[PDB]
Amino acid sequence: AHHHHHHGSATRREKIIELLLEGDYSPSELARILDMRGKGSKKVILEDLKVISKIAKREGMVLLIKPAQCRKCGFVFKAEINIPSRCPKCKSEWIEEPRFKLERK
Rg (CA), the chain: 16
Number of domains making up the chain: 1
Give the separation between CA 18 and CA 5, rounded to whole angstroms. Answer: 18
**DSSP-based three-state secondary structure for 53:** helix
Domain annotation covers residue 1:
no
Range of the domain at 18: 8-105
Give the separation between CA 71 and CA 95, rounded to whole angstroms. Answer: 6
Determine contact, residues 30/52, Cβ cutoff 8 Å.
no
Domain annotation covers residue 45:
yes
Give the separation between CA 2 and CA 85, rounded to whole angstroms. Answer: 45
Domain annotation covers residue 2:
no
Short-list 100, 52, 61, 94, CA closest to 80? 100
> How many secondary structure helices (H) and strands (E) does the chain include?
3, 2
